[PDB]
Design an enzyme around this catalytic site. Structure first.
Site, mmCIF file in Angstrom:
data_model
loop_
_atom_site.group_PDB
_atom_site.id
_atom_site.type_symbol
_atom_site.label_atom_id
_atom_site.label_comp_id
_atom_site.label_asym_id
_atom_site.label_seq_id
_atom_site.Cartn_x
_atom_site.Cartn_y
_atom_site.Cartn_z
ATOM 1 N N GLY A 173 35.098 -18.251 7.060
ATOM 2 C CA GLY A 173 34.600 -17.099 6.808
ATOM 3 C C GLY A 173 35.091 -15.745 7.431
ATOM 4 O O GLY A 173 35.268 -14.595 7.023
ATOM 5 N N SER A 213 40.481 -25.893 6.386
ATOM 6 C CA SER A 213 41.322 -25.578 4.806
ATOM 7 C C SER A 213 42.517 -26.624 4.619
ATOM 8 O O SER A 213 42.897 -26.839 6.359
ATOM 9 C CB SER A 213 42.198 -23.909 4.878
ATOM 10 O OG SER A 213 43.352 -23.736 4.111
#
Lengths: 250, 250
Positions: A173, A213
């Site tokens: 985020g 990621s």
């Protein structure tokens, strides 16, 4: 103890269209993986039929990205039973997007896992702390509460069917790429909790996937961390380089 | 004054098996009607590909039970764009069950509606008051606010793609159907507000459907009301009975 069988999971979120997914399925089908790895693809509900009809790579299972616990009066939703009739035996549960946008509480997640488990599903149970939670120094309290909430509904014998995915929601985020060290820091503490509450047997055999990621560039250095047993991949899992992500679990 | 084309919409909700839907679809394919009716069947996302493959009755369209816009969290969800790309051009939005269990507010339903409209969908926009709302004299205020929120994200030329379904929450899955008059009174309210904002032509052309314990045994008495243009059918939509309900829009 020595690492159990790795998992490479694709979250195809809600992208893909026959146009995109067909060539992507073909690529994975053309790939050969010589090592012991469980690959998992989670297409949107709509795309699960073409995925099942087309997907052939023998290391692969098809997952659902979510599910509800019972069929019946729940417009827009897909139940565990309907998925299981179709021949879908994997499901992702507790994904951070569901907890944050869709009102999925620890209890709600936990109840879905308990049911999917009793329905004979392997489950990828997602866990992770927000930026606000990390900065409050509450990483361990939050992920372990999410985890213990699920463990309270299960018994020792459920865990052969459970997989944990750590989502560094604080990094997601904030647009950051968590380091192999940041990832490992939380995988280690989840495993230490599992070891102490459920056993060394359970702790040694449990896959804990990293759901930050993940790219072909970082996959291998993530996998070399002691308590990382693989990945739940976002964007890169909709690309040919997912093949190299899978290869990095070797 | 005279009624526009009726619609008979089936909401399969969270139900199904390929084992069930194949014979059902076969029946629907063989059903032939002597009047102009738009039939719509709304399977689960997982069952939409099987239905698109097997349904040939040309009075029938396929709807999704829900969708997200480009700006929702995608995990577990199926977007308007993904549906369109599948060739699906009908969508049920703002269902009670979603307003109640899945926190869709008036604004959220409105966004989805406006977005679905911009993308070429015919939208079945659901509205309806709960038992407690009705008891407190709030039926109009509730349904007109649900409607008004939608109406304001739209323009005059949107209304050709809009359908209202009035479902009193107290009539969903309870065996308690709104007497013809209880339903008429609300369809009237809705149409009359439509007319104040949008004028004679729009109000006259708009389909307002009744939902809530529709059966072959009550549908004809309902369809006789002046402001009722057909049905959104739940349990009975998954039975041969649904053909009899469509016939009852003659």
């Amino acid at each position: 103890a020595s690492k159990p069988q790795p998992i490479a999971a694709a979250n195809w979120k809600c992208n893909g269209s026959e146009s995109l997914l067909v060539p992507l399925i073909e690529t994975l089908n053309a790939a050969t993986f010589d090592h012991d790895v469980q690959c998992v693809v989670a297409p949107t509900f709509l795309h699960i039929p073409m995925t099942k009809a087309r997907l052939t790579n023998p290391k692969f299972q098809i997952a659902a990205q979510n599910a509800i616990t019972r069929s019946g009066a729940f417009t827009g939703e897909v139940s565990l039973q309907i998925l299981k009739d179709y021949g879908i035996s994997w499901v992702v549960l507790g994904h951070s997007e569901r907890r944050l946008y869709y009102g999925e509480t620890n209890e709600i997640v936990a109840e879905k896992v308990a049911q999917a488990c009793a329905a004979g599903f392997h489950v990828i149970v997602c866990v992770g702390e927000t930026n606000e939670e990390r900065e409050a120094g509450r990483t361990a309290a939050v992920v372990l509460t999410q985890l213990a909430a699920v463990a309270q509904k299960l018994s020792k014998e459920a865990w052969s069917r459970v997989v944990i995915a750590y989502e560094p929601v604080w990094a997601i985020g904030t647009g950051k790429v968590a380091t192999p060290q940041q990832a490992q820091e939380v995988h280690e503490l989840l495993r230490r909790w599992v070891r102490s509450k459920l056993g060394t047997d359970i702790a040694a055999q449990l896959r804990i996937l990293y759901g930050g990621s993940v790219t072909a560039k970082n996959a291998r250095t993530l996998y070399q961390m002691r308590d990382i047993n693989g990945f739940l991949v976002g964007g890169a899992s909709l690309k040919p380089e997912f093949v190299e992500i899978i290869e990095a679990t070797k």
